[PDB]
Amino acid sequence: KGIYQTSNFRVQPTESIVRFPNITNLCPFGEVFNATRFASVYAWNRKRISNCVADYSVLYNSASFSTFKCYGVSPTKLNDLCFTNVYADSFVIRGDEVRQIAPGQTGKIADYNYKLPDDFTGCVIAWNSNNLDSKGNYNYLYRKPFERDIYFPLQSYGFQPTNVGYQPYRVVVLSFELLHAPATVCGPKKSTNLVKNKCVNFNFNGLTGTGVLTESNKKFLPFQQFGRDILDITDAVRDPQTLEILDITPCSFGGVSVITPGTNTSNQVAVLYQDVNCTEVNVFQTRAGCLIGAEHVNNSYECDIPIGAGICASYQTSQSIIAYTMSLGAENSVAYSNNSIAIPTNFTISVTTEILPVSMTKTSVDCTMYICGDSTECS
Amino acid sequence: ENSVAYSNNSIAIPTNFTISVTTEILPVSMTKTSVDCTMYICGDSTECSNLLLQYGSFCTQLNRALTGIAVEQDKNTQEVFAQVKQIYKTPPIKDFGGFNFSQILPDPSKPSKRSFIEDLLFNKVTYIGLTVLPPLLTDEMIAQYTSALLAGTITSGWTFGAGAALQIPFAMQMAYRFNGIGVTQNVLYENQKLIANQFNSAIGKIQDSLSSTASALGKLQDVVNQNAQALNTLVKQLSSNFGAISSVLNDILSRLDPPEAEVQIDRLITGRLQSLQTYVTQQLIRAAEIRASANLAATKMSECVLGQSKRVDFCGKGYHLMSFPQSAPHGVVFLHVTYVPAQEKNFTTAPAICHDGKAHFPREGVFVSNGTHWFVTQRNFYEPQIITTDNTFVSGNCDVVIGIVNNTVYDPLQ
Amino acid sequence: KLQDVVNQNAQALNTLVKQLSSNFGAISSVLNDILSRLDPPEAEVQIDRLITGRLQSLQTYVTQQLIRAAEIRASANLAATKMSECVLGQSKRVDFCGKGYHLMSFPQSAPHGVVFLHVTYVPAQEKNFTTAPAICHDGKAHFPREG
Amino acid sequence: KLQDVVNQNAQALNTLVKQLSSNFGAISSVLNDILSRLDPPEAEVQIDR
Amino acid sequence: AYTNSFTRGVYYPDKVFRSSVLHSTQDLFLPFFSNVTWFHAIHDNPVLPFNDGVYFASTEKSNIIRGWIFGTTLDSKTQSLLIVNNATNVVIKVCEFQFCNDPFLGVNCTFEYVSFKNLREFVFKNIDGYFKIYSKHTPINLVRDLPQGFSALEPLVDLPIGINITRFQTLLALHAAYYVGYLQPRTFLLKYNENGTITDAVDCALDPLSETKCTLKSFTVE
DSSP states (O other), rough: EEEEEEEEEEEEOEEEEEOOOOOOOTTHHHHHHSSSOOOBGOOEEOOOOOSSSSSSSSTTTTTTEEEEEEEESOOOGGOEEEOOOOOOEEEEEGGGGGGGOOOOOSTTTTTTSSSOOOOOSSSEEEEEHHHHHHOOTTTOOEOOOOOOOOSOOOOOOOOOOOOOOSSSSEEEEEOOOOOOOOOOOOOOOOOOOOOOOSEEEEEEEEEOOOOEEOOOOOOOOOOOOOOOOOSSSSSEEEOOOSSSSEEOOOOOEEEEEEOOOOOOSSSOHHHHHHHHOOOGGOEEEEEEEEEEEEEEEOOOOOSEEEEEETTEEEEEEOOOOEEEEEEOOEEOOOOOOOTEEEESSSSEEEEOOOEEEEEOOOOOOHHHHHHHHHHHTTT | OOOOOOEEEEEEEEEEEEEOOOOOOOEEEOOOOOEEHHHHHTTTHHHHHHHHHTTTHHHHHHHHHHHHHHHHHHHHHHHHTOOOOOOOESSOOOEEEOGGGGGGSOTTTTSSOOOOOHHHHHHHHOOOOOEEEESSSSSHHHHHHHHHHHHHHHHHHHHHHHHHHOOOOOHHHHHHHHHHHHHOTTHHTHHHHHHHHHHHHHHHHHHHHHHHHHHGGGHHHHHHHHHHHHHHHHHHHHOOTTTSSOTTTTHHTTTTTHHHHHHHHHHHHHHHHHHHHHHHHHHHHHHHHHHHHHHHHHHHHHIIIIIOOOOOTTSSEEEEEEEEEEEEEOOOOOOOEEEEEEOOEEEEEEEEEEEEEEEEEEESSSESSSSSSSSEEEEEOOEEEEEEETTTTEEEEESSSSTTTTTTOOOOOO | OOHHHHHHHHHHHHHHTTTTTOOOTOSSSTTHHHHHTTTTHHHHHHHHHHHHHHHHHHHHHHHHHHHHHHHHHHHHHHHHHIIIIIISSSSEEEEEEEEEEEEEEEEEEEETEEEEEEEEEEEEEEEEEEEOOOOEEETTTEEEEEE | OOOHHHHHHHHHHHHHHHSSSSOOOSSSTTHHHHHHHHHHHHHHHHOOO | EEEEESSSOOBBSEEEOOOOOEEEEEEEOOOOOOEEEEEEOOOOOOOOSSSOEEEEEEEEEOOOOOEEEEEEBSSSSOOOEEEOOSSSOEEEEOOBBBOOSSSOEOOOOOEEEOOHHHHHHEEEEEEETTTEEEEEEEEEEOSSOOOSSSOOOEEEEEOOOOOOEEEEEEEEEOOOOOEEEEEEEEEEEEOOOTOOOOOOOHHHHHHHHHHHHHHTTOSSSO
């Protein structure tokens, strides 16, 4: 007999809601990957990219690329994503040196000029260019993260068409900026209609989550994109298609407790869905939650199974689980007056019993035999 | 620096008292939080839940530890307040010998029945898988249990603890409370308006204390502040990176494939698991600190309210007369009534009186001199009785005692 | 109250031993099936996950056991105090040595505990009487010495 | 009963300070002899241990 | 020529709504009670450093101050930001400009953008290649000094330009006074009211009480 927490229940999202920018210009990746010349790595070009739609499968499915190394994103995820700016960096190197363009590698290029950040989020896309740039072509030439840098400190490569990493290699670095600002670049993901007052799997400018969206009373200032509360949980958001501000409420959840008499008595049970309205789930609503399968009774009895908030349940009369407000005891108006005393004319001798723990099992656990056990390699 | 005016024959006896209602405030329970460790650590993600199962039983023993705390906060609230076997109620006519309990007994005018003093106490104290379970005893049932403890204490004294409640007039109960502290009961009946007006005035000072000074509730507000600061810390730890690329789990899962994402998510699982094991350890040590206060509040309810206490400075400073439990948010407040002796005179004294060559010693009380005549007084209130064979007993002769004095002892049969 | 302490001792040992079967992010939870499969540069990366997980599992058990030992010591000090005051004495402390006015107590031992058979006088059969604080006689007021 | 409390305070401080000498799986237990040997991509992996 | 910037040059640090909360932030703010250099426009407008970004302010009745110039040389050796404001439009350009030795408004451009009784406040700062402008316009009745009150600047534009800056100069119409104070990396505790307007702030390096308020995350310390 008791109340057992068996499970957690959560209202699942009914459908998925994507609100990205209402933008239709495709991003200028064609100008990055099909330039008339590529810069020498001493003087590498930087192109910002913004207010456009970025298809990355157009790049990743192109069999022409020799590598597509992505360090804080996976290339098949890039169409699901929104970023503030992309920053495409473009230059040419020797094929023996592409392996230096990673976040913490070292060498004559990476330790001097084109150093990647220790936390680089982005892709490095590179390919051979012997069919375009070999001649040799003594013009391609080399001299803090992302530093531009403008006997001599400058030397050049020996690219001839007979040269494999001895060939000219062409590299584009896509340095995706995931800061908390207007995500001016987003993938080709088709945006869907808005849904409100219902639990949904939402995604606003890449702010993926799940919740009941409701129209806010809060006055955002025109520069704000979303809202917090007392802790750093997102409490409200702005839709990119119409600038109304929506609360996010988390979809309804709670513990599920099974109120049962003992199986030695009965198999009939009642189920308490904690902290929810029954509309979200022979039904009753208590401050503890929605209670299902227990009959509410206007009587009050001692607390057999404690549900909470003054409600208890028990198994009674052919029989069922009942729920009721618990009784504290019989109402004894003591017969007081300024000249009345009651004196006991007889006693009773009661042997009570009081049971106390005094000691507990003297365990000892040999931590080396537990953690490792007979192994020197682990010891 | 009080140099006490001691000498081998000087005693000071208080010629008057003061009745002080002290106040003692005790934590009894704390917020019945329950934190769904999978919804906290992972939250709506199967990709993280399937990793969290690799760490095994930890989540189930965290939910067990917080359920063990949450059950015992009802055990604490039940053991402190449910000392009483029935709900006693006071009569419609309040002839308690002049003692004015109207400020500590419930008022039917309130939407939840509570006393005037209980409403001062209830005013003066202020979603990522975390939840608060309700207490089993709602604050209206705590107010019915303290009203039964009040209506027991006021109509029947300690007798409602020891058996069935037997009524006794309140001026006659307080004459038992005086007899208990070794003040002879005629000191109450002959000063009954003074003792009633001092109790009524001292109950008046409690309202002014609790209204003027919010830090009077400081021992309860500090427990509510520790419950809230530990939940705020546990929720702030959801924003920390722990060495992952990001602290938001959907912005890992939307960016990365499983071979990469599982390396990042194991840092957030390891950090959020360390953050929950820190919270549950702090909460288990804090639950042991509240249970040690609930057992003390249950013991002050058993000994000060259901009884009268001989334990010096246990039931407030002074010689204890009685106590009234008022409930407060997650605690209890005891209004300890104490007799304090107040207005001394210095007297000459003797251990024994030499009369008829015999030595006489006081049965109850002390010998004292007003400078011309010798009297025996009760110890805790100056009431001089002429020395007789009725208030003194003989032993031996005048030789054996260091400091005995010669005087007559009167024989009432003469 | 005793069977619950034996159940908590057994449930904490069963949890501590169940945590030996967990992977913690290693390839396997049995240490010999790492060591028989892998060379030292590889095996030490897997075994550090099981060392870190089993060390966290033992520091959890010993922390629970230290908090639980403080809870049993607070009960042993109460049982020692009920032995000193109820058995070796008679108690004026209301409802300490059982409900009623305390007469005496008998300690019986129990597995990892003690049981006190508290004998108490309970008053049982009231009559209502009229009463007075004092009796006026000879113009004097008389008060009862006891009673 | 007092000397045992002073002994427990001192033994817990001695254990806490002895744990500064342990490697925990890093290349070394002295933080300056990581930082003077290694660059940030390498040193941050050792220092996290 | 100097004055004291009481509790001035605080701005909304990120594009997030917050309300009824005390947020502890670390950014390039103007320190509380700092010395600010107070120039006269006549007898004349000198070139100033741009050490971490600046709080710039103007007092006016007729808006005679109508732009700013920024860079490291201001002589066509390198790119320079020019901001001009004819009150009907802001115009912004980054060209390799050849400026005159005395710049004024008469009565290789890789980026372009277009959009006393008044105190006009501006905060200019560089972060990761974005040149950010925060601004506010307020009514005051004081030419001599900055006002003793708190007011929070709201973002006016962020322009991604990728340009190095160490110097700047304000420019005016050629047919008055202006203030310059330099930002510093500071922790601040910022108070957001019920509307999510920031109405007060604590500079966590000013004095031991501000360092205590900022430690407790509260504007009252018991």
